[PDB]
Amino acid sequence: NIKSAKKRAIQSEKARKHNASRRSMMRTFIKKVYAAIEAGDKAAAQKAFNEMQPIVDRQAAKGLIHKNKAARHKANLTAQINKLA
Amino acid sequence: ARYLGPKLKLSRREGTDLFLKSGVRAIDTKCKIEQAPGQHGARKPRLSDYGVQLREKQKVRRIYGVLERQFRNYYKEAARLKGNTGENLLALLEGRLDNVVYRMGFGATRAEARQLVSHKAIMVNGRVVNIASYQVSPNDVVSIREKAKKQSRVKAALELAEQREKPTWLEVDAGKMEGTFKRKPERSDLSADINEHLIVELYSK
Amino acid sequence: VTSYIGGEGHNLQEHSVILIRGGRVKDLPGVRYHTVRGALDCSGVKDRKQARSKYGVKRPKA
Amino acid sequence: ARTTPIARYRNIGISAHIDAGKTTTTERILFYSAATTAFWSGMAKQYEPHRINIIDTPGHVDFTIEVERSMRVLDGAVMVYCAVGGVQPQSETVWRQANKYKVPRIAFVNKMDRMGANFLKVVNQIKTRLGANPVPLQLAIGAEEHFTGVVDLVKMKAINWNDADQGVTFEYEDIPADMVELANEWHQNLIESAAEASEELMEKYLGGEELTEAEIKGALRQRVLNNEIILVTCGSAFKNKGVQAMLDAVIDYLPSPVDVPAINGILDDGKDTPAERHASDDEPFSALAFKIATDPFVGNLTFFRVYSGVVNSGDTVLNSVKAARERFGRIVQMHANKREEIKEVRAGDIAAAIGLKDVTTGDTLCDPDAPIILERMEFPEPVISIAVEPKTKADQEKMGLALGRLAKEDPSFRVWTDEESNQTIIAGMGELHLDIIVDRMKREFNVEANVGKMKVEVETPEENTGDVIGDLSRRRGMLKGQESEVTGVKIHAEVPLSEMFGYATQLRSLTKGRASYTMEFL
Amino acid sequence: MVTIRLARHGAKKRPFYQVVVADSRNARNGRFIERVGFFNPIASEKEEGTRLDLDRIAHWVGQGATISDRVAALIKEVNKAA
RNA sequence: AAAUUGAAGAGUUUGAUCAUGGCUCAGAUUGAACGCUGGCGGCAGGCCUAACACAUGCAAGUCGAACGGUAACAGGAAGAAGCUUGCUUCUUUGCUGACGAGUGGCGGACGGGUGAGUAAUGUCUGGGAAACUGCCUGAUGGAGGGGGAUAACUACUGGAAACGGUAGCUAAUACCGCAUAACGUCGCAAGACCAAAGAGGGGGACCUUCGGGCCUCUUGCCAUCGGAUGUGCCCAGAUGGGAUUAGCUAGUAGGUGGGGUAACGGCUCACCUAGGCGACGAUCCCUAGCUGGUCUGAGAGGAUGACCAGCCACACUGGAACUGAGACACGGUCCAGACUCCUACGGGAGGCAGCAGUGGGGAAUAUUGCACAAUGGGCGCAAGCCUGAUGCAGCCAUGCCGCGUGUAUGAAGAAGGCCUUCGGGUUGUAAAGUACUUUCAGCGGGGAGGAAGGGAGUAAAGUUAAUACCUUUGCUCAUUGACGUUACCCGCAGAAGAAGCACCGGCUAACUCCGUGCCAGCAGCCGCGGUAAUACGGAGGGUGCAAGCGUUAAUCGGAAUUACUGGGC
Ligand SMILES: Nc1nc2c(ncn2[C@@H]2O[C@H](COP(=O)(O)OP(=O)(O)O)[C@@H](O)[C@H]2O)c(=O)[nH]1
């Protein structure tokens, strides 16, 4: 480039790699919960929900997503699993 | 920014005496002041409405030594102000610093008073003012500023300042070289021939 | 557009560039512009001594 | 402040005929008109780094302003010569150009790497054709292809260059018996000439003794300065040979801005010492815009050499010739084409000013008080007139601006749409000159344009009289005076004006490019 | 970081600043939330060449507004201990 | 208290009149241009067209008090260089000040630009709920414990460079799990779940592995609720012209469920209903950034959106996103295009509508400038560094304002000009002559203020556990201004260095002669000139304005001539 905003380019790329890693992991756990919910096993779905919950809340804490987004995931999943029986 | 020409031409174009010469000798004996300056001055123009309005306005401009710009300003103010437009305008014209210098002597003519103001030979309350348009405020002084006295011309002007209507608002000191401005001249404290309403309608046309 | 050539005597050939201003001629029907004399190789009227700013004549000594 | 002392400043020109070697030697210099500087410490890392300001020139008779408008900015001249031809008519031209401005010349006889190359013969050629009196600084070693180095007449060594790496790793050698006798002969003929600087040198040598090379180099530099002699060197820029010793000779004989008397100016008109000024860092600012350029990037760029004074980036200046006000924003001094912006220039520098929208060539830039004129009020007259027309009849505004800018740049190139009919006619100084003008129009100010369509007085060598007159009688040409001067023959002829159309080029091929003329409407 | 800074009105070679409580983003002369007194650095007999609005400055700085260097110095000079 | 008090007509249809009616002029204004002319100062103004397209030079860095460290300088330490055991200086040691590059943090979304797009996703006014907010601030707490890396520094290689395949790695306020956290999240509940980072200053100890440990304070870190701020969203009204644009709309209008968002929402998907908008102008087409305000007007209104300020929009064209509190990002990423430049031909690199500057276009618009001294802004504990923000300087009568270009005196009312009824008049007190003054310009000398601060020393308390070290608040000390040869002041010389432009038939103020002869020419309108031209051209004179004047262009007025106020058939 021109200035040393190239340093920020490197940092943004590295942070994108990391954020894509963590967002993919988180979304995969939620895919698991959704596959359970469309499978109907309220207990398997419950285990999956308790498996994703610390992941998504830890990510919200990290800032990868927002508190509101994590809470929205948890609320949607609780509603689903409760109507799931 | 100053009319550097024959003053008597102006005066006899107005017909009247506008005093641009030191009123020490005469007016007729220096210029043939009854006929217009032209080779056709002996003839007589009709002087319609606009003619008389322009001629009065130019008489005032030539008396006070003001140019058309800043005369339009002396009208813009005194139109903004309160009271009579023409009276406020004549007051704003007597407030000029070369005006009060002349009316208090120190120069036998408005142009001599202009040189006096301009050459830092004057001091409105000590502070050397040299803006010939300085609108002097009431309750103020003029203080002719030593090294500007005894040049014999301020003396001659002080001597010749008599034989003239003594201003009802000045209180000069004639040698102590002080001079006050106790209050602005009202209407009747001036020539009374100058029909200020003509100028007002010229500029409000 | 057509444009008058004020003043007395000009030098205008077919390729001379000139400055055009407004101001009709009132007896040439259809001429609503005036060639600015003394601008853009359109020299000002020779031997003028009054109203020289118009017709672009530089002040003689006289 | 000043990076290099004024004494360590050389303002040198490289002028010669065509393809004599100028640009090649300049490239060898950058390794070991286009103004460009260099830092040549020495041949043995001696001579703490000098700043040599080199103004590479054209040698074509078309671009003769491009060399005369740098001659009266230069302080020294490095006249290049080929070794098979030596003095050419083009060589005689730039020679007279330098004699007009009284430049202290040295010479560099290039192309000793060619067959038929000679050194003695070319020295004598200079002495006979031009009029110079040359002192051979070097003498070739190796006739045409065997050329390996030279012998000096001061060091008495052989600087035979190493041809493994180009020309940098030269060796000093034993000046062997290849030529070690003519070496002595010309060494003595050099001493006898350096004795010609003072009576106390006549008494010095006449004691039957050879003086020391230190006070021989000083004496010969004095002689070059007073223009009393000319020092000729010997190299081959294409075979990377001889160039560094010509640079040495440049350091050792050419003048610095202080090795000359002051520059005489004018206060308001010709006075006694009106504005005589000397090159110093403390003087009031004074310069001379020797070249106007048309920046490809900007369209305006003014060359100038500061004679007396120190100007800055932003300093206001006085167009003492034009009587106006000029100001500075960007000052660039760099190689032929590149531009290295700096902050200020001192006396003895050569830089390019910018935004200088008023000063034409040869006009003096100076501080509000400095010389109204600084000489240089004469450049040649165009010799060739042609008309021109763009591809579309209405791009003549583009064309007129292009040919007003190019005319500003080249004061020896006019333009005036003659009001006879309307035709925009172009007056240059040569066929190739006008080719260059038209292609610069097509390339820079892109407008593709196709070109089209008295008592003459001619001078020429007294050998081409028969043909030039056959040519003049070939044209509808009656003549006036059959008078021959002394360095030629002055022909006078009455010829049409719709005629001759190329008389300059016809004449140049006809006269061996050694004739001038004039045709101003009898 | 809501600042309280001087705003540099006036004329050339004759400044006159206005103490303005403005978001530190906006330009010097630009957008501001409120103005709290002025400051005239070139006074001889004028209104001290300074005047502040201390109750509102205190309101702001209680709401966390940062005070610039010169505005701190002007609160000093207004508090007659300095 | 005052925050207003403000409204003019004329010329021209006719032989003449009165109406109707258009045209024209008198005013104010301009980012102006052109012609002629031009002395100065102050304050402003300055590409209105090609959002044409840009070369270079600068416009965004900072922190060593986060870290690994040592490339540069310096300080030292050991010298068996230089040598008179050195003051006459050899290398190794990050050891210390410091610091290139590197990891990391914050900034880079601000400030600066332009008005292309945008007729409503915008703007203005006024409300609203379904929200987030770095830095700033308040309240309560936590701030155990540990790992793997990974840049630089470097094993095998590429690559002209940019800069990649693998590795040997080593740090951290880089990353990751754990422990722990509830007025925090989910959940009606129970219950489940979530973080962190340390660095610096000195010191009474007293303990060491000269690492330090330890006590302190200064900052920094994590969580939650607050404020302030900023931002996102919704609504209503208003915000151009054309109907020689009357139908438009299918995610279209809404409903349900899932998904998405920081947040509500057809935002989105899948069904379902068939709705919704429209003569209060939908739809389409042209044009356009909007507002405070600016010009004008007695107003109402008309025109406008240069400067300055608020909002919006764009960044070579088209698209997408990433990082981040904040962007779908002027000086970042990626792609497609056009363009330009570099190349060793193998490859790349860029986007002036940032500041200058440039070509070009145009009637037309400036400095490749000086400082960050002010004030702001980023970083920082600060010192400081950076800032084409900003403050200043340059150019240009571009505008407004102020001043000067002399003042008094002076009748042979000179000469000369011009007119003349031949007497004279006018030029004209005008000149000259005489006396006096020297503003400004020019020299020379003094000289405010924009400068607050910051730093070093000091003392007091607050401080601790300690008179240390930190703050805070005084005292002293040296000091910091680009502008700048500042403003302003004083002295020197002499009226010297400083007046032009338009007009004179009526409107409209100011006339004669000559030469010209419906010619040349003038003209804003009416019109003038074909042999006595105040209308053309010159001269003499006069009138207006004046460092400007006039012309052209543009807006309102006058124009009640789009009549709402305030018109007519
Ligand atoms: N053989 C030979 N050729 C040379 C020498 N110097 C220059 N040249 C050739 O001359 C050609 C052009 O010469 P140039 O540098 O342009 O000189 P110019 O005429 O002044 O422009 C180049 O291709 C060179 O090879 C030399 O010393 N020997």
mmCIF file with all atom_site columns, C-alpha atoms (C1' of nucleotides) in Angstrom, chain F residues 325-460:
data_model
loop_
_atom_site.group_PDB
_atom_site.id
_atom_site.type_symbol
_atom_site.label_atom_id
_atom_site.label_alt_id
_atom_site.label_comp_id
_atom_site.label_asym_id
_atom_site.label_entity_id
_atom_site.label_seq_id
_atom_site.pdbx_PDB_ins_code
_atom_site.Cartn_x
_atom_site.Cartn_y
_atom_site.Cartn_z
_atom_site.occupancy
_atom_site.B_iso_or_equiv
_atom_site.pdbx_formal_charge
_atom_site.auth_seq_id
_atom_site.auth_comp_id
_atom_site.auth_asym_id
_atom_site.auth_atom_id
_atom_site.pdbx_PDB_model_num
ATOM 1   C "C1'" . A F 1 325 ? -17.762 -0.119  19.664  1.00 0.00 ? 325 A F "C1'" 1
ATOM 2   C "C1'" . G F 1 326 ? -18.232 2.316   15.072  1.00 0.00 ? 326 G F "C1'" 1
ATOM 3   C "C1'" . A F 1 327 ? -17.357 1.016   7.682   1.00 0.00 ? 327 A F "C1'" 1
ATOM 4   C "C1'" . C F 1 328 ? -19.904 -2.254  3.988   1.00 0.00 ? 328 C F "C1'" 1
ATOM 5   C "C1'" . A F 1 329 ? -14.261 1.943   4.835   1.00 0.00 ? 329 A F "C1'" 1
ATOM 6   C "C1'" . C F 1 330 ? -10.607 9.293   0.289   1.00 0.00 ? 330 C F "C1'" 1
ATOM 7   C "C1'" . G F 1 331 ? -5.163  8.159   1.485   1.00 0.00 ? 331 G F "C1'" 1
ATOM 8   C "C1'" . G F 1 332 ? -7.727  -0.522  3.782   1.00 0.00 ? 332 G F "C1'" 1
ATOM 9   C "C1'" . U F 1 333 ? -9.178  -6.032  1.350   1.00 0.00 ? 333 U F "C1'" 1
ATOM 10  C "C1'" . C F 1 334 ? -11.036 -8.976  -2.675  1.00 0.00 ? 334 C F "C1'" 1
ATOM 11  C "C1'" . C F 1 335 ? -13.044 -9.571  -7.350  1.00 0.00 ? 335 C F "C1'" 1
ATOM 12  C "C1'" . A F 1 336 ? -14.805 -7.661  -12.782 1.00 0.00 ? 336 A F "C1'" 1
ATOM 13  C "C1'" . G F 1 337 ? -13.800 -3.301  -16.057 1.00 0.00 ? 337 G F "C1'" 1
ATOM 14  C "C1'" . A F 1 338 ? -11.371 0.970   -18.213 1.00 0.00 ? 338 A F "C1'" 1
ATOM 15  C "C1'" . C F 1 339 ? -6.954  3.609   -17.469 1.00 0.00 ? 339 C F "C1'" 1
ATOM 16  C "C1'" . U F 1 340 ? -1.845  4.741   -16.086 1.00 0.00 ? 340 U F "C1'" 1
ATOM 17  C "C1'" . C F 1 341 ? 3.020   3.415   -14.508 1.00 0.00 ? 341 C F "C1'" 1
ATOM 18  C "C1'" . C F 1 342 ? 7.383   -0.228  -13.275 1.00 0.00 ? 342 C F "C1'" 1
ATOM 19  C "C1'" . U F 1 343 ? 9.754   -4.795  -15.257 1.00 0.00 ? 343 U F "C1'" 1
ATOM 20  C "C1'" . A F 1 344 ? 15.457  -8.260  -15.687 1.00 0.00 ? 344 A F "C1'" 1
ATOM 21  C "C1'" . C F 1 345 ? 9.342   -10.122 -19.460 1.00 0.00 ? 345 C F "C1'" 1
ATOM 22  C "C1'" . G F 1 346 ? 9.230   -14.147 -15.175 1.00 0.00 ? 346 G F "C1'" 1
ATOM 23  C "C1'" . G F 1 347 ? 5.579   -10.506 -12.659 1.00 0.00 ? 347 G F "C1'" 1
ATOM 24  C "C1'" . G F 1 348 ? 3.379   -6.683  -10.305 1.00 0.00 ? 348 G F "C1'" 1
ATOM 25  C "C1'" . A F 1 349 ? 1.775   -1.461  -8.495  1.00 0.00 ? 349 A F "C1'" 1
ATOM 26  C "C1'" . G F 1 350 ? -1.967  2.917   -8.262  1.00 0.00 ? 350 G F "C1'" 1
ATOM 27  C "C1'" . G F 1 351 ? -6.576  5.832   -7.890  1.00 0.00 ? 351 G F "C1'" 1
ATOM 28  C "C1'" . C F 1 352 ? -5.891  14.309  -5.934  1.00 0.00 ? 352 C F "C1'" 1
ATOM 29  C "C1'" . A F 1 353 ? -14.030 15.087  -5.573  1.00 0.00 ? 353 A F "C1'" 1
ATOM 30  C "C1'" . G F 1 354 ? -7.178  15.721  0.822   1.00 0.00 ? 354 G F "C1'" 1
ATOM 31  C "C1'" . C F 1 355 ? -3.329  20.231  0.180   1.00 0.00 ? 355 C F "C1'" 1
ATOM 32  C "C1'" . A F 1 356 ? -0.484  22.553  -3.354  1.00 0.00 ? 356 A F "C1'" 1
ATOM 33  C "C1'" . G F 1 357 ? 0.081   21.518  -8.432  1.00 0.00 ? 357 G F "C1'" 1
ATOM 34  C "C1'" . U F 1 358 ? -1.019  19.728  -13.743 1.00 0.00 ? 358 U F "C1'" 1
ATOM 35  C "C1'" . G F 1 359 ? -3.138  18.849  -18.896 1.00 0.00 ? 359 G F "C1'" 1
ATOM 36  C "C1'" . G F 1 360 ? -7.746  19.955  -20.607 1.00 0.00 ? 360 G F "C1'" 1
ATOM 37  C "C1'" . G F 1 361 ? -12.614 22.460  -20.805 1.00 0.00 ? 361 G F "C1'" 1
ATOM 38  C "C1'" . G F 1 362 ? -14.123 27.274  -20.078 1.00 0.00 ? 362 G F "C1'" 1
ATOM 39  C "C1'" . A F 1 363 ? -15.625 34.250  -20.501 1.00 0.00 ? 363 A F "C1'" 1
ATOM 40  C "C1'" . A F 1 364 ? -13.515 32.818  -15.849 1.00 0.00 ? 364 A F "C1'" 1
ATOM 41  C "C1'" . U F 1 365 ? -10.960 31.325  -10.443 1.00 0.00 ? 365 U F "C1'" 1
ATOM 42  C "C1'" . A F 1 366 ? -4.596  31.401  -6.573  1.00 0.00 ? 366 A F "C1'" 1
ATOM 43  C "C1'" . U F 1 367 ? 0.610   29.077  -3.512  1.00 0.00 ? 367 U F "C1'" 1
ATOM 44  C "C1'" . U F 1 368 ? 4.145   21.407  -5.947  1.00 0.00 ? 368 U F "C1'" 1
ATOM 45  C "C1'" . G F 1 369 ? 4.278   27.721  0.144   1.00 0.00 ? 369 G F "C1'" 1
ATOM 46  C "C1'" . C F 1 370 ? 5.739   28.627  6.637   1.00 0.00 ? 370 C F "C1'" 1
ATOM 47  C "C1'" . A F 1 371 ? 4.699   26.512  11.307  1.00 0.00 ? 371 A F "C1'" 1
ATOM 48  C "C1'" . C F 1 372 ? 2.308   23.081  14.312  1.00 0.00 ? 372 C F "C1'" 1
ATOM 49  C "C1'" . A F 1 373 ? 3.762   29.145  18.467  1.00 0.00 ? 373 A F "C1'" 1
ATOM 50  C "C1'" . A F 1 374 ? -2.754  29.360  19.212  1.00 0.00 ? 374 A F "C1'" 1
ATOM 51  C "C1'" . U F 1 375 ? -6.874  26.237  19.282  1.00 0.00 ? 375 U F "C1'" 1
ATOM 52  C "C1'" . G F 1 376 ? -8.325  21.368  18.286  1.00 0.00 ? 376 G F "C1'" 1
ATOM 53  C "C1'" . G F 1 377 ? -7.475  15.874  16.926  1.00 0.00 ? 377 G F "C1'" 1
ATOM 54  C "C1'" . G F 1 378 ? -4.789  10.698  17.278  1.00 0.00 ? 378 G F "C1'" 1
ATOM 55  C "C1'" . C F 1 379 ? -1.205  8.118   20.433  1.00 0.00 ? 379 C F "C1'" 1
ATOM 56  C "C1'" . G F 1 380 ? 1.042   8.418   25.105  1.00 0.00 ? 380 G F "C1'" 1
ATOM 57  C "C1'" . C F 1 381 ? 2.092   8.314   32.574  1.00 0.00 ? 381 C F "C1'" 1
ATOM 58  C "C1'" . A F 1 382 ? 3.905   12.057  30.545  1.00 0.00 ? 382 A F "C1'" 1
ATOM 59  C "C1'" . A F 1 383 ? 7.779   14.657  27.828  1.00 0.00 ? 383 A F "C1'" 1
ATOM 60  C "C1'" . G F 1 384 ? 6.784   14.488  23.156  1.00 0.00 ? 384 G F "C1'" 1
ATOM 61  C "C1'" . C F 1 385 ? 5.614   12.788  17.989  1.00 0.00 ? 385 C F "C1'" 1
ATOM 62  C "C1'" . C F 1 386 ? 2.241   13.484  13.792  1.00 0.00 ? 386 C F "C1'" 1
ATOM 63  C "C1'" . U F 1 387 ? -1.545  16.535  11.612  1.00 0.00 ? 387 U F "C1'" 1
ATOM 64  C "C1'" . G F 1 388 ? -1.828  20.211  3.674   1.00 0.00 ? 388 G F "C1'" 1
ATOM 65  C "C1'" . A F 1 389 ? -6.878  20.095  10.511  1.00 0.00 ? 389 A F "C1'" 1
ATOM 66  C "C1'" . U F 1 390 ? -5.801  24.839  11.987  1.00 0.00 ? 390 U F "C1'" 1
ATOM 67  C "C1'" . G F 1 391 ? -3.034  29.358  12.446  1.00 0.00 ? 391 G F "C1'" 1
ATOM 68  C "C1'" . C F 1 392 ? -0.365  32.337  9.081   1.00 0.00 ? 392 C F "C1'" 1
ATOM 69  C "C1'" . A F 1 393 ? 2.093   34.055  4.483   1.00 0.00 ? 393 A F "C1'" 1
ATOM 70  C "C1'" . G F 1 394 ? 1.828   34.504  -1.256  1.00 0.00 ? 394 G F "C1'" 1
ATOM 71  C "C1'" . C F 1 395 ? -1.294  35.849  -6.064  1.00 0.00 ? 395 C F "C1'" 1
ATOM 72  C "C1'" . C F 1 396 ? -5.564  38.388  -7.982  1.00 0.00 ? 396 C F "C1'" 1
ATOM 73  C "C1'" . A F 1 397 ? -9.396  45.803  -7.286  1.00 0.00 ? 397 A F "C1'" 1
ATOM 74  C "C1'" . U F 1 398 ? -13.041 39.829  -6.763  1.00 0.00 ? 398 U F "C1'" 1
ATOM 75  C "C1'" . G F 1 399 ? -16.040 42.274  -3.137  1.00 0.00 ? 399 G F "C1'" 1
ATOM 76  C "C1'" . C F 1 400 ? -16.949 45.696  1.343   1.00 0.00 ? 400 C F "C1'" 1
ATOM 77  C "C1'" . C F 1 401 ? -14.532 49.389  4.314   1.00 0.00 ? 401 C F "C1'" 1
ATOM 78  C "C1'" . G F 1 402 ? -10.803 53.249  5.394   1.00 0.00 ? 402 G F "C1'" 1
ATOM 79  C "C1'" . C F 1 403 ? -7.023  56.629  3.703   1.00 0.00 ? 403 C F "C1'" 1
ATOM 80  C "C1'" . G F 1 404 ? -3.854  59.271  0.288   1.00 0.00 ? 404 G F "C1'" 1
ATOM 81  C "C1'" . U F 1 405 ? -2.839  61.366  -4.283  1.00 0.00 ? 405 U F "C1'" 1
ATOM 82  C "C1'" . G F 1 406 ? -1.528  67.952  -0.854  1.00 0.00 ? 406 G F "C1'" 1
ATOM 83  C "C1'" . U F 1 407 ? -3.320  72.635  2.266   1.00 0.00 ? 407 U F "C1'" 1
ATOM 84  C "C1'" . A F 1 408 ? -3.815  78.042  2.412   1.00 0.00 ? 408 A F "C1'" 1
ATOM 85  C "C1'" . U F 1 409 ? -2.703  81.858  -0.958  1.00 0.00 ? 409 U F "C1'" 1
ATOM 86  C "C1'" . G F 1 410 ? -2.595  83.703  -5.896  1.00 0.00 ? 410 G F "C1'" 1
ATOM 87  C "C1'" . A F 1 411 ? -5.478  88.385  -10.846 1.00 0.00 ? 411 A F "C1'" 1
ATOM 88  C "C1'" . A F 1 412 ? -0.569  90.070  -15.347 1.00 0.00 ? 412 A F "C1'" 1
ATOM 89  C "C1'" . G F 1 413 ? -8.382  86.920  -14.258 1.00 0.00 ? 413 G F "C1'" 1
ATOM 90  C "C1'" . A F 1 414 ? -0.957  85.052  -17.793 1.00 0.00 ? 414 A F "C1'" 1
ATOM 91  C "C1'" . A F 1 415 ? 0.264   82.146  -22.001 1.00 0.00 ? 415 A F "C1'" 1
ATOM 92  C "C1'" . G F 1 416 ? -2.283  78.251  -24.737 1.00 0.00 ? 416 G F "C1'" 1
ATOM 93  C "C1'" . G F 1 417 ? -6.971  75.951  -26.093 1.00 0.00 ? 417 G F "C1'" 1
ATOM 94  C "C1'" . C F 1 418 ? -12.087 76.726  -27.367 1.00 0.00 ? 418 C F "C1'" 1
ATOM 95  C "C1'" . C F 1 419 ? -16.180 79.713  -28.378 1.00 0.00 ? 419 C F "C1'" 1
ATOM 96  C "C1'" . U F 1 420 ? -17.271 84.571  -30.090 1.00 0.00 ? 420 U F "C1'" 1
ATOM 97  C "C1'" . U F 1 421 ? -22.321 89.057  -31.709 1.00 0.00 ? 421 U F "C1'" 1
ATOM 98  C "C1'" . C F 1 422 ? -15.148 90.175  -32.468 1.00 0.00 ? 422 C F "C1'" 1
ATOM 99  C "C1'" . G F 1 423 ? -16.463 93.651  -27.580 1.00 0.00 ? 423 G F "C1'" 1
ATOM 100 C "C1'" . G F 1 424 ? -15.469 89.552  -24.989 1.00 0.00 ? 424 G F "C1'" 1
ATOM 101 C "C1'" . G F 1 425 ? -16.399 84.999  -22.396 1.00 0.00 ? 425 G F "C1'" 1
ATOM 102 C "C1'" . U F 1 426 ? -14.723 80.140  -20.828 1.00 0.00 ? 426 U F "C1'" 1
ATOM 103 C "C1'" . U F 1 427 ? -10.687 77.206  -19.427 1.00 0.00 ? 427 U F "C1'" 1
ATOM 104 C "C1'" . G F 1 428 ? -9.618  79.541  -14.263 1.00 0.00 ? 428 G F "C1'" 1
ATOM 105 C "C1'" . U F 1 429 ? -7.315  80.402  -8.602  1.00 0.00 ? 429 U F "C1'" 1
ATOM 106 C "C1'" . A F 1 430 ? -7.092  76.591  -12.456 1.00 0.00 ? 430 A F "C1'" 1
ATOM 107 C "C1'" . A F 1 431 ? -1.824  76.842  -13.650 1.00 0.00 ? 431 A F "C1'" 1
ATOM 108 C "C1'" . A F 1 432 ? 2.563   79.433  -12.333 1.00 0.00 ? 432 A F "C1'" 1
ATOM 109 C "C1'" . G F 1 433 ? 4.392   82.232  -8.179  1.00 0.00 ? 433 G F "C1'" 1
ATOM 110 C "C1'" . U F 1 434 ? 4.380   82.595  -2.330  1.00 0.00 ? 434 U F "C1'" 1
ATOM 111 C "C1'" . A F 1 435 ? 3.703   80.246  2.510   1.00 0.00 ? 435 A F "C1'" 1
ATOM 112 C "C1'" . C F 1 436 ? 2.781   75.754  5.347   1.00 0.00 ? 436 C F "C1'" 1
ATOM 113 C "C1'" . U F 1 437 ? 1.955   70.393  6.345   1.00 0.00 ? 437 U F "C1'" 1
ATOM 114 C "C1'" . U F 1 438 ? 4.418   65.008  5.178   1.00 0.00 ? 438 U F "C1'" 1
ATOM 115 C "C1'" . U F 1 439 ? -1.104  60.874  6.271   1.00 0.00 ? 439 U F "C1'" 1
ATOM 116 C "C1'" . C F 1 440 ? 0.246   56.737  3.289   1.00 0.00 ? 440 C F "C1'" 1
ATOM 117 C "C1'" . A F 1 441 ? 4.454   54.927  0.214   1.00 0.00 ? 441 A F "C1'" 1
ATOM 118 C "C1'" . G F 1 442 ? 10.219  55.041  0.841   1.00 0.00 ? 442 G F "C1'" 1
ATOM 119 C "C1'" . C F 1 443 ? 14.641  54.867  4.405   1.00 0.00 ? 443 C F "C1'" 1
ATOM 120 C "C1'" . G F 1 444 ? 16.391  54.414  9.751   1.00 0.00 ? 444 G F "C1'" 1
ATOM 121 C "C1'" . G F 1 445 ? 15.492  53.144  14.775  1.00 0.00 ? 445 G F "C1'" 1
ATOM 122 C "C1'" . G F 1 446 ? 12.213  51.092  18.935  1.00 0.00 ? 446 G F "C1'" 1
ATOM 123 C "C1'" . G F 1 447 ? 8.424   47.739  19.878  1.00 0.00 ? 447 G F "C1'" 1
ATOM 124 C "C1'" . A F 1 448 ? 2.963   45.302  22.481  1.00 0.00 ? 448 A F "C1'" 1
ATOM 125 C "C1'" . G F 1 449 ? -0.165  41.091  22.182  1.00 0.00 ? 449 G F "C1'" 1
ATOM 126 C "C1'" . G F 1 450 ? -1.878  36.554  20.473  1.00 0.00 ? 450 G F "C1'" 1
ATOM 127 C "C1'" . A F 1 451 ? 2.021   32.532  25.730  1.00 0.00 ? 451 A F "C1'" 1
ATOM 128 C "C1'" . A F 1 452 ? -1.750  29.449  28.158  1.00 0.00 ? 452 A F "C1'" 1
ATOM 129 C "C1'" . G F 1 453 ? 1.511   26.322  29.333  1.00 0.00 ? 453 G F "C1'" 1
ATOM 130 C "C1'" . G F 1 454 ? 5.305   22.683  29.725  1.00 0.00 ? 454 G F "C1'" 1
ATOM 131 C "C1'" . G F 1 455 ? 10.009  21.591  32.313  1.00 0.00 ? 455 G F "C1'" 1
ATOM 132 C "C1'" . A F 1 456 ? 13.804  21.816  36.303  1.00 0.00 ? 456 A F "C1'" 1
ATOM 133 C "C1'" . G F 1 457 ? 14.205  23.201  41.782  1.00 0.00 ? 457 G F "C1'" 1
ATOM 134 C "C1'" . U F 1 458 ? 11.340  24.093  46.051  1.00 0.00 ? 458 U F "C1'" 1
ATOM 135 C "C1'" . A F 1 459 ? 7.586   23.665  50.318  1.00 0.00 ? 459 A F "C1'" 1
ATOM 136 C "C1'" . A F 1 460 ? 3.004   22.274  52.273  1.00 0.00 ? 460 A F "C1'" 1
#
